Design an enzyme around this catalytic site. Structure first.
Site, PDB file in Angstrom:
ATOM      1  N   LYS A 100     157.872 109.109 -22.810  1.00 13.41           N
ATOM      2  CA  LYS A 100     157.322 107.759 -22.855  1.00 13.41           C
ATOM      3  C   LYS A 100     157.103 107.237 -24.273  1.00 13.41           C
ATOM      4  O   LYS A 100     156.934 106.027 -24.449  1.00 13.41           O
ATOM      5  CB  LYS A 100     156.029 107.699 -22.042  1.00 13.41           C
ATOM      6  CG  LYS A 100     154.856 108.445 -22.630  1.00 13.41           C
ATOM      7  CD  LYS A 100     153.864 108.800 -21.534  1.00 13.41           C
ATOM      8  CE  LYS A 100     152.813 109.785 -22.002  1.00 13.41           C
ATOM      9  NZ  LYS A 100     153.393 111.144 -22.200  1.00 13.41           N
ATOM     10  N   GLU A 135     146.871 109.608 -30.544  1.00 13.51           N
ATOM     11  CA  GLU A 135     148.148 110.299 -30.432  1.00 13.51           C
ATOM     12  C   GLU A 135     148.395 111.093 -31.716  1.00 13.51           C
ATOM     13  O   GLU A 135     147.533 111.179 -32.588  1.00 13.51           O
ATOM     14  CB  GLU A 135     149.274 109.302 -30.153  1.00 13.51           C
ATOM     15  CG  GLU A 135     149.338 108.848 -28.699  1.00 13.51           C
ATOM     16  CD  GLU A 135     149.620 109.971 -27.718  1.00 13.51           C
ATOM     17  OE1 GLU A 135     150.807 110.316 -27.532  1.00 13.51           O
ATOM     18  OE2 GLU A 135     148.657 110.488 -27.113  1.00 13.51           O
ATOM     19  N   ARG A 136     149.578 111.694 -31.826  1.00 12.72           N
ATOM     20  CA  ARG A 136     149.873 112.527 -32.987  1.00 12.72           C
ATOM     21  C   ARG A 136     149.982 111.686 -34.254  1.00 12.72           C
ATOM     22  O   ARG A 136     150.551 110.591 -34.243  1.00 12.72           O
ATOM     23  CB  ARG A 136     151.173 113.307 -32.786  1.00 12.72           C
ATOM     24  CG  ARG A 136     151.233 114.160 -31.535  1.00 12.72           C
ATOM     25  CD  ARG A 136     152.584 114.844 -31.434  1.00 12.72           C
ATOM     26  NE  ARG A 136     152.732 115.648 -30.229  1.00 12.72           N
ATOM     27  CZ  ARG A 136     152.900 115.147 -29.015  1.00 12.72           C
ATOM     28  NH1 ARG A 136     152.942 113.845 -28.802  1.00 12.72           N
ATOM     29  NH2 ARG A 136     153.034 115.973 -27.985  1.00 12.72           N
TER      30      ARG A 136
HETATM   31  N1  LIG Z   1     166.895 109.961 -24.064  1.00 11.65           N
HETATM   32  C1  LIG Z   1     166.510 111.230 -24.270  1.00 11.65           C
HETATM   33  N2  LIG Z   1     167.458 112.194 -24.375  1.00 11.65           N
HETATM   34  C2  LIG Z   1     167.069 113.459 -24.583  1.00 11.65           C
HETATM   35  N3  LIG Z   1     165.833 113.946 -24.709  1.00 11.65           N
HETATM   36  C3  LIG Z   1     164.920 112.977 -24.599  1.00 11.65           C
HETATM   37  C4  LIG Z   1     165.162 111.632 -24.384  1.00 11.65           C
HETATM   38  N4  LIG Z   1     163.969 110.924 -24.327  1.00 11.65           N
HETATM   39  C5  LIG Z   1     163.051 111.846 -24.510  1.00 11.65           C
HETATM   40  N5  LIG Z   1     163.553 113.110 -24.674  1.00 11.65           N
HETATM   41  C6  LIG Z   1     162.829 114.356 -24.913  1.00 11.65           C
HETATM   42  O1  LIG Z   1     161.426 114.126 -24.818  1.00 11.65           O
HETATM   43  C7  LIG Z   1     160.792 114.716 -25.970  1.00 11.65           C
HETATM   44  C8  LIG Z   1     159.455 114.075 -26.235  1.00 11.65           C
HETATM   45  O2  LIG Z   1     159.571 112.638 -26.295  1.00 11.65           O
HETATM   46  P1  LIG Z   1     158.298 111.711 -26.207  1.00 11.65           P
HETATM   47  O3  LIG Z   1     157.460 111.890 -27.413  1.00 11.65           O
HETATM   48  O4  LIG Z   1     158.776 110.263 -25.964  1.00 11.65           O
HETATM   49  O5  LIG Z   1     157.521 112.194 -24.883  1.00 11.65           O
HETATM   50  P2  LIG Z   1     156.123 111.869 -24.184  1.00 11.65           P
HETATM   51  O6  LIG Z   1     156.127 112.047 -22.710  1.00 11.65           O
HETATM   52  O7  LIG Z   1     155.735 110.461 -24.630  1.00 11.65           O
HETATM   53  O8  LIG Z   1     155.135 112.890 -24.931  1.00 11.65           O
HETATM   54  P3  LIG Z   1     153.702 112.936 -25.584  1.00 11.65           P
HETATM   55  O9  LIG Z   1     152.669 112.310 -24.688  1.00 11.65           O
HETATM   56  O10 LIG Z   1     153.422 114.417 -25.888  1.00 11.65           O
HETATM   57  O11 LIG Z   1     153.857 112.210 -26.944  1.00 11.65           O
HETATM   58  C9  LIG Z   1     161.842 114.549 -27.057  1.00 11.65           C
HETATM   59  O12 LIG Z   1     161.603 115.367 -28.196  1.00 11.65           O
HETATM   60  C10 LIG Z   1     163.108 114.943 -26.304  1.00 11.65           C
HETATM   61  O13 LIG Z   1     163.256 116.352 -26.198  1.00 11.65           O
HETATM   62 MG   LIG Z   2     155.437 111.184 -27.831  1.00  9.99          MG
END
Ligand SMILES: Nc1ncnc2c1ncn2[C@@H]1O[C@H](COP(=O)(O)OP(=O)(O)OP(=O)(O)O)[C@@H](O)[C@H]1O
Ligand SMILES: [Mg+2]
Ligand SMILES: Nc1ncnc2c1ncn2[C@@H]1O[C@H](COP(=O)(O)OP(=O)(O)OP(=O)(O)O)[C@@H](O)[C@H]1O
Ligand SMILES: Nc1ncnc2c1ncn2[C@@H]1O[C@H](COP(=O)(O)OP(=O)(O)O)[C@@H](O)[C@H]1O
Ligand SMILES: [Mg+2]
Ligand SMILES: [Mg+2]
Lengths: 173, 512, 458, 460
Positions: free
Chosen positions: C154, C180-181
């Protein structure tokens, strides 16, 4: 333990006593109230579940030589809230508030040797430098210090005992 | 061991004089302010449920009367208030503007205009909290409330004075179904009320825009308690709408009230309770949450003409009034076991279950026939609809059971085959698009075509085009019969013969 | 003029004279050693006691410290001068550049715009990602929410939206980093500065190492800035890094404020705390705010009260799922739960609606076949149920797409797919005109052309 | 004079203080003037010196702190006997039918002890409902309790109405109807049904409806039960119909939260079983007279496992458990033969023919339930011939349970049907032994009598 619920009553009673300047008389009134609370036959009654009005008026009949208008009305408020056992603590906090207002402090002096009058004199002068308040020294004799003097201004403590110096050294090594 | 608002200067005042003077029991002082709840010291004469006036023009409702304290909830922006402010108790319970002039307006829960079209032209004030008509003042519900959706009007009838629950998960069409039901009353003689609890303001703007595109807005009152308004206003918002609905009921007219997210009311009453430190219950809801919805929904009634004559002091004779309620509840992934859903299911006269698995498979509106029930029964239908709909409900339930059984068995038997592909076709037939409500003649015509087997040879994908073509053909060639059914709802061998002729002539001479 | 009298965690109680007690949400100030500390008033208790949240480290506070009463709320720099810079919750510059030359400051506590002031628009705002536009079209001036558990994409999806939306948007934008980070923000800032687009973005950071008060009030600050740029008559893009943390900060503080717990240990006022913030991030007749909000869901539980109440406040909701990410399919959008208020025949046209509903119908049928496939395998399916399964698998694979921001992971070049191309592709797949390609040909290809080309490469 | 004052008002709970000498007893009643209206209070607890915690028997709005309160030195007492027949009354025994004063000669208190162990009576006279599944699987005695267990919308009210028609008209004696947390619309429907049937003059009605405060709904049942006990002690045989026992317990829960009782499991009151037992034990038949009781019980979420349905199971002689699943499939009545039974289904009591027929039906249906799941995997293709005969018998037997009700002709168009015990034993034995698989499955459905089943098959 009623240390935390005693503060409002102590403060309010002290302010009222100050407005009418009879602080010493108020302290007498509260001392009388605190001693009746310690009685064997009263300490049974105070724990019973009587309605505040009846219980209070029994206490008031027993509490002769108080002022109807002000002191006995403090009794009424404490009875309403069911806090008559707070009186032995309200008394101590009233005395503390008085000591604060009168800019006067009580401190303890402790040593293994009974202190000479010149030592006590210089102690009082020095403490009155450290403390804005005038000081009443209390002499306690305890072989624990082994030598030197322990200064105890309540929570603020200055340790001048050989034993303290020794058990402080033991942890350095 | 704890204090109880015994604080220094108050104690000193009581020390000076224990039997403090009577002064005025009418007034007091705020001693605490937090999260929209205030504690007041004094107010010896404040009644439970009474309005307390605050500096500026603001009010609070006295909910807790305790030993030398009143707990009150502030009906607006509270953060401007402060300790030591004076407050005065009124003599008043909460009342709201009421009347015919509210039609076409958007108002807040205090009845203040919010659409900007100027001041109201109400007809006096009515109490927000009121008692429902008694057992001897009711009358049985027998007149219909025409929703315009084939599935609802056939299988789950709604009558004047019924309380029909609309229940389902998020984004399942609950709001759309209710508001389409409002739109179908555009030319029905039933006034409509839409009360929105806890919704975001622009959604209300959007539904008012759809209500304004169609002619329905000039026939409805909209009562709004947005997500930014205090919990007291959200909690009181349904009752003000009920108090506006009761105006028409008590004067021999019909009204339809659409409470929206009664659950977002329950959250509000919970917030008030837990801020007022009352003992919590299941899912931390207050114990008396059943009583809230129970005394709201029991106001939806049909009242006999003697009650209407007694109330209107003889000005209206011989007419029954009615208030019909359509509460909306949101389920957490469909678990009926939750506390608020189980209470509102216990209170109401019926349930319309909307399912995401049906909504995702193209079956919109997604009413589940097997678990949706109406207590009134066909007693709230026109008689033609009654005949035809009877078979439909049983047919759909049985079809679902047979579909599962015969598909994993991968099997066939003749009568079962015939039943299965009739059920599939009627299931396809009850699908319907938004903002296209059907008159009773159209519904009865299509249901007659389904029940009498004219769909038996139409292929499944052409059922929708068959329906559209049939309705257009009939709307040009046989309009007097449609006018007659729409005006009377009757059903005779003459009506049946004419409908048979229409279906025969259509299926011979037309195409789809 | 006031004294600290209790210290519980991040919550501080202060005593004032009866005639001088602060208002709610006034800002107080304390010397904490060589530091300055700001306290925000939450509640007025009896007797001149006032209870506050420390906007900074609570460590090192004694009782009896003198507190100074600043007679106004927390107020932040605002307007064109706040642009291209990084700021504290208190509106202080956190980049090492100099003072912010602001002409105006606004209090972070404000009333929401009136119902009479609102506005509505049907204008489709195309986003490059294929799945979001077809399943959940998002219009300019509306709210979009990305729902997902931990590590499901996300944040990355929002960076692709930032890239694609900035193509056709000309005006200013605000970014609120909430709990967040720090590294994500640092990387973002240097990407913005190395591409010279920083001159148009204003940044507020309240990241996850800061004490609860900072993380609670940082969101409100960002809304204050976005509302300034709206009220100048512009159109504004507001990105919120994680709105879940805002409710969780209130949870962390709530029990210390002396409030009974509600539901799963949450604060009793949760719905109002969420609503009072959500109702002022909205468009008006003078200007419009377009916003994307990341919504973390705890323990992958989409029924938890915080995500549950967040759903109601959004126009387009995209729901990400770990099960799909584990299959390699990115972006991991679940088409059977992602939805938009804009997916109407009138708004997007009958083709745009019919294609989306066909995709959903086919996928939904795929779900119902999975239990019999699980127990008995595919050979016991009906001869057209097999065809449904084949087309559903192809559709699932064609929803996947290479992102320009995922080159750092995949290594594959990124792709942008316009609307007049993706609905053509899905309509053809549904009608079976491209049914002859193998499943793998649809994985991570931009358009139908690239799928048939990839099938030529096996 | 009035000797007490209100000190707190929290919802339905009113705190009253009296001088320490004259403190009212538990379950005493007090009276206060709320605005223009007299409000009755009932004492629940004595706490501290001079204070009683009480429950309001009306709307709490308008009460002030410091209102005077008068201690009526007795529990709530209601009019009983012949003067109550044909009248509708509330919890306090006031008339709510607008026909004037009750004109009673005696008033009894709604709180009383149960009959002594020495005073109980044992008799097993069977009663005939005319409803197949009930007469077959759960035969009634006279003087026992009958529980109708069901969730929302499964037929409790329709079954109670059909049972009222069939049992009451033949009863030739008085009856009491208690509406506890009942919908006002349904109360009006029942009242008009009783007057149109011209049976109202043998029935006394007590209504406490959903909108009423918790105090009213809590004590309504005890009022109706007190009337039933008055008729019993005169030596009569009476019917007591209670329209839902669940909301007695639920009003108790709402009250319990604010009484300061510490919560219990599933959020219920600690006293749940005690409160239920204090109600149910009064409902018995003694050596002087007989109360026959029919009770509906709401089971939340169809759980059947949470404490309120669990506790109520123990008290009842006859148990009929309506199931949502059977109703959803469209079959009425929705009685589950695998969970419904009566302690009268004893081969000594009913006789061999009846007993072995009913038990055979139940055995068949359990075997069917076992086959039903793996039929989905196997079809009937991989099932055996022994299974095929059993499934045919079971399916048609299940349809033969379905009966149209005279009440339900509104829902159905078809006339209500009546079936005798001997007849339906013949019919179920007829498919048990005669095995008339000659006939289509729907010929067994909603026909009523065995003869009408075969005639329906003869028509199609
Ligand atoms: N389009 C994509 N193709 C491949 N991997 C993806 C893609 N989108 C996201 N990812 C994977 O998701 C990982 C984390 O992405 P992101 O920071 O957006 O996640 P999140 O659910 O928002 O996490 P958090 O809450 O910990 O920040 C990326 O490092 C990658 O491995
Ligand atoms: Mg993230
Ligand atoms: N008959 C219908 N045909 C097509 N779309 C429909 C139909 N009924 C409703 N919808 C669509 O369903 C979507 C959700 O509508 P609605 O807001 O009424 O749902 P809901 O279940 O009440 O949701 P919520 O509780 O989130 O407000 C909208 O996009 C609306 O257009
Ligand atoms: N024997 C029956 N015949 C037809 N419909 C019935 C029958 N029993 C129950 N129902 C259906 O149940 C609903 C009303 O049942 P009711 O007993 O009022 O609900 P509850 O069981 O919750 O009291 C209506 O849909 C009604 O048609
Ligand atoms: Mg909706
Ligand atoms: Mg019922």
């Amino acid at each position: 333990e009623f240390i935390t619920v005693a503060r409002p009553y102590a403060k309010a009673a002290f302010d009222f006593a100050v407005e009418h300047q009879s602080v010493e008389r108020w302290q007498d009134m509260l001392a009388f109230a605190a001693e009746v609370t310690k009685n064997e036959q009263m300490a049974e009654l105070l724990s019973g579940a009587l309605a505040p009005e009846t219980l209070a008026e029994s206490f008031i009949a027993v509490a002769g030589e108080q002022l109807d208008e002000n002191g006995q009305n403090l009794i009424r408020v404490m009875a309403e809230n069911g806090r008559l056992n707070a009186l032995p603590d309200v008394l101590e906090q009233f005395i503390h508030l008085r000591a604060v207002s009168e800019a006067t402090a009580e401190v303890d002096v402790i040593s293994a040797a009974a202190l000479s009058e010149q030592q006590l004199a210089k102690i009082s002068a020095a403490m009155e430098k450290r403390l804005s308040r005038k000081v009443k020294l209390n002499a306690k004799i305890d072989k624990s210090v082994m030598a030197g003097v322990i200064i105890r201004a309540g929570d603020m403590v200055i340790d001048g005992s050989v034993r303290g110096r020794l058990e402080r050294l033991a942890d350095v090594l | 061991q704890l204090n109880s608002t015994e604080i220094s200067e108050l104690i000193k005042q009581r020390i000076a004089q224990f039997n403090v003077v009577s002064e005025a029991h009418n007034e007091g002082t705020i001693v605490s302010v937090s999260d929209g709840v205030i504690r007041i010291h004094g107010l010896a004469d404040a009644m439970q449920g009474e309005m307390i006036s605050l500096p500026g023009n603001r009010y609070a409702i006295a909910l807790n009367l305790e030993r030398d304290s009143v707990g009150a909830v502030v009906m607006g922006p509270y953060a401007d208030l402060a300790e030591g402010m004076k407050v005065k108790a009124t003599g008043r319970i909460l009342e709201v503007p009421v009347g015919r002039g509210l039609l076409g307006r958007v108002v807040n829960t205090l009845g203040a205009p919010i659409d900007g079209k100027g001041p109201l032209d109400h007809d006096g004030f009515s109490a927000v909290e009121a008692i429902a008509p008694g057992v001897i003042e009711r009358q049985s519900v027998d007149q219909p409330v025409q929703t315009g959706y084939k599935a609802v009007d056939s299988m789950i009838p709604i009558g004047r004075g019924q309380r029909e629950l609309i229940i389902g998960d998020r984004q399942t069409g609950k709001t759309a179904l209710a508001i389409d039901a409002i739109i179908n009353q555009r030319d029905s003689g039933i006034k409509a009320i839409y009360v929105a609890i806890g919704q975001k303001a622009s959604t209300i703007s959007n539904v008012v825009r759809k209500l304004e595109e169609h002619g329905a807005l000039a026939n409805t009152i909209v009562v709004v308690a947005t997500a930014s308004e205090s919990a007291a206003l959200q909690y009181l918002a349904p009752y003000a709408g009920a108090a506006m609905g009761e105006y028409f009921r008590d004067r021999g007219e019909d009204a339809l009230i659409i409470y929206d997210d009664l659950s977002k009311q329950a959250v509000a009453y919970r917030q008030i309770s837990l801020l007022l430190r009352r003992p919590p219950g299941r899912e931390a809801f207050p114990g008396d949450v059943f009583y809230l919805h129970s005394r709201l929904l029991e106001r939806a009634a049909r009242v006999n003409a003697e009650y209407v004559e007694a109330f209107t002091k003889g000005e209206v004779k011989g007419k029954t009034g009615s208030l019909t309620a359509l509460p909306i509840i949101e389920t957490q992934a469909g678990d009926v076991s939750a506390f608020v859903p189980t209470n509102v299911i216990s209170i109401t006269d019926g349930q319309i279950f909307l399912e995401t698995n049906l909504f995702n498979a193209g079956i919109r509106p997604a009413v589940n026939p097997g678990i949706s029930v109406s207590r009134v029964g066909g007693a709230a239908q026109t008689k033609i609809m009654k005949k035809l709909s009877g078979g439909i409900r049983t047919a759909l339930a049985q079809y679902r059971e047979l579909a599962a059984f015969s598909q994993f068995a991968s099997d066939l038997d003749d009568a079962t085959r015939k039943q299965l592909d009739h059920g599939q076709k009627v299931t396809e037939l009850l699908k319907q698009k938004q903002y296209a409500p059907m008159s009773v003649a159209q519904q009865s015509l299509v249901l007659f075509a389904a029940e009498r087997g004219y769909l038996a040879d139409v292929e499944l994908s052409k059922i929708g085009s068959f329906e559209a073509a049939l309705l257009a053909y009939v709307d040009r060639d046989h309009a007097p019969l449609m006018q007659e059914i729409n005006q009377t709802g009757g059903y005779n061998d003459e009506i049946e013969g004419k409908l048979k002729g229409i279906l025969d002539s259509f299926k011979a001479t037309q195409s789809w | 003029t006031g004294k600290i009298v209790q210290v519980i965690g991040a919550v501080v109680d202060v005593e004032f004279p009866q005639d001088a007690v602060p208002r709610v949400y006034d800002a107080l100030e304390v010397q904490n050693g060589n530091e300055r500390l700001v306290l925000e008033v939450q509640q007025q208790l009896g007797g001149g006691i006032v209870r506050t949240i420390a906007m900074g480290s609570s460590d090192g506070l004694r009782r009896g410290l003198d507190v100074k009463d600043l007679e106004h709320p927390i107020e932040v720099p605002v307007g064109k001068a706040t642009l291209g810079r990084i700021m504290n919750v208190l509106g202080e510059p956190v980049d090492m550049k100099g003072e912010i030359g602001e002409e105006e400051r606004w209090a972070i506590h404000r009333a929401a715009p009136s119902y009479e002031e609102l506005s509505n628009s049907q204008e489709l705002l195309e986003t490059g990602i294929k799945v979001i536009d077809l399943m959940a079209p998002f219009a300019k001036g509306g709210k979009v929410g990305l729902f997902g558990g931990a590590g499901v994409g996300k944040t990355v999806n929002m960076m692709e939206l930032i890239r694609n939306i900035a193509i056709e948007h000309s005006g200013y934008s605000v970014f609120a980093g909430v709990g967040e980070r720090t590294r994500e923000g640092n990387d973002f800032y240097h990407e913005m500065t190395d591409s010279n687009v920083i001159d148009k973005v204003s940044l507020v950071y309240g990241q996850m190492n800061e004490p609860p008060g900072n993380r609670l009030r940082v969101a409100l600050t960002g809304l204050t800035m976005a509302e300034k740029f709206r009220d100048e008559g512009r159109d504004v893009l507001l990105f919120v890094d994680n709105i879940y943390r805002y409710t969780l900060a209130g949870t962390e503080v709530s029990a210390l404020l002396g409030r009974m717990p509600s539901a799963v240990g949450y604060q009793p006022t949760l719905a109002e705390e969420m609503g009072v913030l959500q109702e002022r991030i909205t468009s008006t007749k003078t200007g419009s705010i377009t916003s994307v909000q990341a919504v973390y869901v705890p323990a992958d539980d989409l029924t938890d009260p915080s995500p549950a109440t967040t759903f109601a406040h959004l126009d387009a909701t995209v729901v990400l799922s770990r099960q799909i990410a584990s299959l390699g399919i990115y972006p991991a959008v679940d088409p059977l739960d992602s939805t938009s208020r804009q997916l109407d025949p009138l708004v997007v046209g009958q083709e745009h609606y019919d294609t989306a509903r066909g995709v959903q119908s086919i996928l939904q049928r795929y779900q119902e076949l999975k239990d019999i496939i699980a127990i008995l395998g595919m050979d016991e399916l009906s001869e057209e149920d097999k065809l449904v399964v084949a087309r559903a698998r192809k559709i699932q694979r064609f929803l996947s797409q290479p992102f320009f921001v995922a080159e750092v992971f995949t290594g594959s070049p990124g792709k942008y797919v316009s609307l007049k191309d993706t609905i053509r592709g899905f309509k053809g797949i549904m009608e079976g005109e491209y049914d002859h390609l193998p499943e793998q040909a649809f994985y991570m290809v931009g358009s139908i052309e690239e799928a048939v080309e990839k099938a030529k490469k096996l």
